[PDB]
């Protein structure tokens, strides 16, 4: 039922068209086994063939006429064979794949539909709960998995057809209790298989967990880099802990992973045993009883009943995610909770005007617990009024302006709109009939002409042009290119607020209610615009009745009636004079007021090379890599042996033949292999633990002394950084284990392959070859196009996906609530046409994996029938093509090879390259010379010349063109020019972050862009507006180690005392040892500058760098900033940046500088003296 039941609904000629596939499925994996026993029937007759020409020195004619007369009996039954079970292949594969598509195919599609439009049904509750950003994030995401789920299904139906009934088949009919022997030893050694491998491979699973774990403590906060690079260099503590966790459960999860390797030895070993008993159990029951060399086709062929139950297990998986995940979030889909609004039918109001009244309505907000805002508001309002609400603690106006438009319904008493009951007429209906416009001013990513359009489907550019024209937009427009039909550059970002805003007006006008409610539109917008656009929303008013909640008194004046509120407690009502009469609410308050990426140079070798560098040596590993393919190989041979000796062979000792050839095997395989393995996993995987830890190592450090535009301008955010560091580590760790893998398979398929190759017989080695090179490019081009149309979708269902979103995640249209459908409706198109498209695409991975299948089977009739070739008297064909077959299955060893193991090299080696370009950089200030620190450098006269610069985005025009300034000693150089850029990047410029374009700076005679990096930044009192400190102690941090800087204590009681934070250190638990608590959060920006200021007296510095330090606080906070800074100032030079046009009087040289170039300058009441640009700073003060 649900689950699975909903989990399938939906598909008349689907579901049966479903089914049908299905039966294809099963015909399909029953198809390989039937190709078994067939094996069986011409290794057997085969078999016969050559135990006669063992017997020979007799009738050659008897002999010439047997052997070819077997040789055409059975060239046919190939003929038909491959005929049948290939044309078989073929065909119902295409057909299941036909299953797959068109069934999960308009599944999903309905799906689809039903999903958006569920979404853009559930309402309110959509902007309740959720996360909204998350919600559309498993709209994509679960409805693709569902698909898989619908097609590997498909798979999974198959394989495991192909175990039941090949096992079973072959494993009861062939053998009556040979068969059920096979069942015997088969199958108990296919459990002890996977029982113990499964059993350590979850136990790599935990080694894995105690691995993220050691990750994160592995991982440390990176961020904060800017005060990073002010203070010196971590690492220590990043190396410590970093390579600390990293070689503890490196060789720990490496000896789960050589002990993944001592399960790839497990398995091999079992493999061995399958081997064992197999050929034991044969050589027994086919040299006693049942004597046919064609014990061969029942064992194999079960065997391959256990790999296909395995297949058969990630398919199911797939089924399984598909099927928890969709059905669950499927029941968060096509449920119908809605109720509390809907979309349909309901009450008509003809009447048109109507008077608007709350009676007694107690309302709690959605969030259960929170209190009840409204608890029992009474509030009429006549027609053709204007009523405004006034407040200030949040959460009441705003709530009753809300469920004005029924958005929540109310939780007692009611609300009547004209004069019937709001919950009793149709909704959409009412949102149209109720115009309103909110603070935020959502646009969509459309034109002008269009966003009105969206107010209201049907209009023409005229109606639209008197629309605007009546919001007063008609100007802007105009003057704006593209005129109406002029975009908003991806999202409402391209115009100011002010315009938005009136669009919206424009638009809810356009729609023309009778109702208009503004929730404090004007808020949040410069003064001018706020007269303009009162002065709209005023000439869209009064033919309107309107209720406005606002913090505007100002243009709260003109209200018919005012209304009482400050947080969900209404009082006072009526007129201005009235409430100012009353001294209460009003008049008090109105008194109160007065990731992506991705680098095109890759590097071919060079990670190779630079792979070396990062190893010190292991042919030891390279060494069994080679050994071991040669293992396999091996086994291939010595197969073909022993089902060739005792098909073939003297009579006697076929037992010790058999117990030889038997013991071999496992010897052989089980033991080289457990052995190469083990070997190799501690070599290759201890490789990957030093690179990775060593790797990083360098590559962090890398960053350390990396800086300049790099964290000063980064689009590589702290994330990305840290990932760079985990990730990549772990990515080039696969490009060492690849290469060994490489020379592996290679020396196994290459070199043994051909060593037995040329013991082959012509025919066969050049037939084969021709097999594996080919069928192998059909899997490559396979996948190549498989990805292909998988990334084309993810593109046009992106686009879908796209705008969707946009709508979701701007619930804001539900507001006109007049596009829901629309909106989906124009997604339909878009989906229509991924629709049409996932049907073609459909047929396609149908024709490709058939003829997969198709290049199967026709490499086995090629293979069999022309190696038997001509055998007339006895020719060289006889048992050898099963070595032949060998190299068939060496190729087929080479695709275990790239199917398994470290990644397929490609993400490993970009993300190679990644962590290459960044581990190299270009140091650009490390340590050097550049200065000597002569004991007469301790001025501080700071000098710029030319000062010309511009962070790394040149053709933005610099923000530094020809700029001059300098500064005296001992002294406080005053800074202040138009707003963000210019007062930042000098101070930066002083730091040497970035070295100006042209010109250069003097510290105090040396030249700054040449001077020692490292000293120019160790005399630097640098305190910027968002301060910060890790999440050490009070007292480290205060001893911020600037370099050999040993954690002075009493020098710190130096730093808490002068930056008047001692305050905090006297008492509060712990004094000096208090961590930050929780990276920071538990002090105030006040106290946490204090510490900061701390840090720059710490450091002694001969000049200060205040970059408007205290710009968000309050009380005795910036006062005692104020004066510890007056203190910590005077003694050594100081520029100090502000924008505090107050405190900024007591200063030795004011410099007005206007972006770029300084305009004013010298002491405070002369540039006042200079009536103009400083002037104009201080009257807009006031
Ligand atoms: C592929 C199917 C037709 C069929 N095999 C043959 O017809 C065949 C004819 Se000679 C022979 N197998 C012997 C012999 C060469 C030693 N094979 C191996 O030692 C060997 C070692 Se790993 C491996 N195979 C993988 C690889 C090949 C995918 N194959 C299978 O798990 C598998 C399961 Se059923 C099956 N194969």
Redesign the pocket.
């Known amino acids: 039922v649900s689950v699975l039941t909903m989990f399938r609904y939906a598909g008349w000629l689907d579901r049966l068209y479903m089914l049908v596939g299905t039966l294809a499925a099963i015909i399909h994996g029953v198809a390989l086994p039937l190709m078994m026993l067939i094996?069986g029937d011409m290794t057997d007759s085969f078999a016969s063939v050559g135990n006669v020409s063992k017997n020979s020195t007799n009738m050659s004619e008897a002999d010439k006429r047997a052997m070819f007369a077997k040789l055409e009996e059975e060239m046919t039954t190939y003929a038909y064979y491959y005929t049948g079970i290939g044309a078989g292949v073929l065909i119902v594969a295409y057909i299941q794949v036909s299953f797959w598509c068109l069934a999960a195919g308009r599944q999903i599609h309905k799906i689809r539909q039903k999903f958006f439009h569920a979404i853009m049904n559930q309402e309110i509750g959509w902007f309740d709960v959720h996360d909204v950003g998350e919600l559309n994030t498993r709209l994509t995401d679960d409805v693709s998995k569902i698909n898989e789920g619908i097609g590997d299904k498909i798979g999974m139906f198959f394989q495991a057809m192909a175990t039941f009934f090949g096992g079973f088949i072959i494993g009861f009919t062939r053998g009556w209790k040979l068969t059920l022997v096979i069942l015997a030893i088969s199958p108990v050694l296919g459990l002890s298989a996977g029982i113990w491998a499964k059993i350590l491979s979850s136990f790599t699973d935990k080694e894995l967990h105690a691995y993220a774990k050691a990750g994160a403590v592995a991982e440390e906060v990176l961020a904060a880099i800017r005060t990073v690079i002010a203070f010196g260099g971590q690492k220590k503590e990043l190396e410590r802990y970093n390579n600390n966790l990293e070689e503890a459960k490196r060789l720990g999860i490496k000896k789960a992973i050589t002990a993944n390797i001592s399960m790839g030895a497990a398995f091999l070993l079992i493999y061995a045993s399958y081997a064992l008993a197999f050929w034991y159990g044969t050589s027994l029951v086919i040299s006693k009883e049942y004597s046919i060399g064609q014990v061969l086709t029942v064992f194999?062929?079960v065997?391959?009943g256990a790999?296909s139950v395995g297949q058969a297990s990630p398919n199911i998986e797939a089924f399984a995610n598909a099927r928890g995940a969709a059905y669950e979030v499927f029941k968060i889909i096509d449920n119908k909770p809605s109720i509390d609004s809907f979309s349909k039918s309901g009450h008509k109001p003809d009447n048109i005007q109507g008077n608007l009244e709350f009676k007694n309505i107690h309302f709690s907000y959605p969030s259960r617990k929170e209190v009840q805002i409204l608890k029992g508001l009474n509030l009429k309002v006549k027609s053709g009024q204007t009523v405004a609400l006034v407040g200030n603690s949040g959460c009441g106006k705003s709530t009753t302006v809300q469920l004005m438009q029924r958005l929540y319904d109310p939780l007692d008493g009611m609300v009547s709109i004209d004069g019937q009951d709001i919950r009793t007429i149709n909704v959409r209906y009412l949102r149209e009939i109720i115009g309103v416009v909110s603070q935020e001013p959502v646009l969509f990513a459309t034109t002008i002409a269009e966003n009105i359009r969206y107010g209201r489907e049907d209009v023409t550019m005229d109606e639209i042009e008197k629309a605007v024209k009546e919001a007063n937009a008609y100007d802007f427009i105009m003057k704006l290119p593209h005129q109406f039909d002029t975009l908003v550059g991806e999202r409402g970002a391209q115009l100011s607020g002010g315009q938005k805003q009136r669009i919206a007006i424009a638009r809810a006008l356009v729609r023309n209610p009778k109702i208009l409610l503004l929730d404090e539109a004007t808020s949040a917008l410069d003064t001018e615009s706020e007269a303009v656009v009162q002065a709209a929303l005023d000439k869209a008013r009064e033919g309107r009745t309107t209720i406005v909640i606002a913090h505007r008194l100002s243009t709260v004046r003109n209200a018919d009636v005012i209304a009482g509120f400050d947080g969900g407690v209404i009082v006072e009502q009526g007129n201005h004079d009235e409430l100012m009469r009353e001294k209460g609410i009003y008049f008090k308050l109105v008194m109160t007021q007065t990731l992506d990426e991705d680098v095109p140079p890759a590097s071919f070798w060079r990670i190779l090379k630079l792979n070396s560098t990062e190893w010190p040596y292991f042919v030891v590993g390279i060494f069994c890599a080679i050994i071991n393919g040669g293992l396999?190989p091996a086994?291939?041979v010595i197969?073909?042996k022993v089902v060739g000796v005792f098909t073939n062979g003297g009579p006697p000792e076929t037992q010790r033949q058999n117990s030889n050839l038997f013991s071999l095997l496992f010897l052989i395989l089980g033991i080289i292999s457990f052995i190469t393995f083990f070997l190799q996993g501690f070599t290759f995987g201890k490789a990957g633990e030093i690179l990775t830890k060593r790797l990083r190592y360098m590559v962090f450090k890398s960053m350390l002394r990396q800086d300049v535009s790099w964290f000063d301008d980064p689009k590589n955010t702290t994330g990305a950084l840290t990932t760079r560091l985990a990730n990549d580590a772990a990515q080039v760790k696969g490009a060492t284990g690849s290469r060994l893998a490489v020379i592996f398979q290679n020396i196994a398929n290459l070199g043994t392959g051909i060593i037995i190759s040329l013991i082959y017989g012509w025919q066969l080695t050049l037939l084969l070859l021709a097999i594996v090179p080919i069928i192998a490019i059909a899997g490559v081009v396979e996948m190549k196009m498989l990805s292909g149309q998988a990334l084309k979708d993810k593109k046009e269902l992106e686009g879908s996906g796209k705008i969707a979103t946009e709508a979701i995640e701007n619930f804001r249209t539900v507001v006109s609530l007049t596009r829901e459908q629309k909106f989906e409706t124009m997604y339909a198109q878009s989906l229509q046409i991924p629709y049409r498209n996932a049907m073609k695409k459909a047929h396609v991975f149908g024709i490709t994996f058939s003829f997969t299948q198709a290049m199967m089977y026709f490499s086995?009739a090629a293979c069999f029938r022309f190696g038997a070739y001509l055998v007339t008297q006895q020719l060289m064909t006889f048992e050898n093509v099963?070595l032949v077959?060998?190299a068939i299955?060496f190729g087929?060893?080479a695709?275990?090879q790239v199917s398994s193991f470290a990644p397929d090299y490609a993400k490993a080696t970009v993300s190679a390259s990644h962590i290459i370009r960044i581990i190299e950089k270009t140091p650009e200030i490390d340590s050097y010379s550049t200065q000597g620190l002569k004991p007469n450098m301790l001025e501080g006269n700071v000098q710029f010349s030319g000062v010309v610069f511009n962070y790394p985005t040149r053709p933005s025009i610099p923000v530094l063109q020809g700029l001059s300034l300098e500064v005296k000693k001992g002294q406080t150089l005053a800074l202040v020019g138009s707003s963000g850029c210019g007062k930042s990047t000098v101070v930066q410029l002083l730091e040497r972050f970035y070295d100006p374009m042209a010109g250069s700076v003097f510290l105090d005679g040396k030249e700054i862009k040449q001077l020692n990096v490292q000293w120019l930044r160790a005399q630097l009192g640098i305190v910027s507006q968002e301060p910060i400190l890790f999440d050490c102690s009070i007292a480290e941090n205060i001893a911020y180690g600037d370099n050999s800087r040993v954690v002075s204590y009493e020098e710190i009681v130096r730093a808490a005392k002068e930056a008047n934070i001692h305050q905090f250190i006297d008492s509060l638990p712990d004094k000096y040892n208090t961590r930050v608590g929780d990276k920071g959060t538990q002090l105030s920006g006040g106290q946490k500058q204090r510490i900061a200021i701390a840090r720059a007296l710490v450091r002694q510095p001969h000049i200060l760098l205040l970059d408007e330090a205290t710009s968000a606080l309050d009380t005795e906070s910036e006062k005692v900033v104020q004066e510890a800074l007056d203190k910590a100032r005077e003694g050594r030079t100081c520029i100090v940046i502000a924008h505090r046009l107050s405190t900024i009087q007591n200063a030795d040289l004011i410099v007005v500088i206007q972006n770029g170039k300084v305009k004013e300058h010298g002491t405070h009441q002369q540039l006042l003296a200079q009536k103009g640009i400083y002037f104009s700073m201080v009257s807009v003060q006031a």
Do not use: K, T
């Open positions: 094996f194999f062929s065997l391959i790999f396999q086994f291939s197969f073909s086995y099963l077959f060998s299955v087929a060893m695709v275990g």
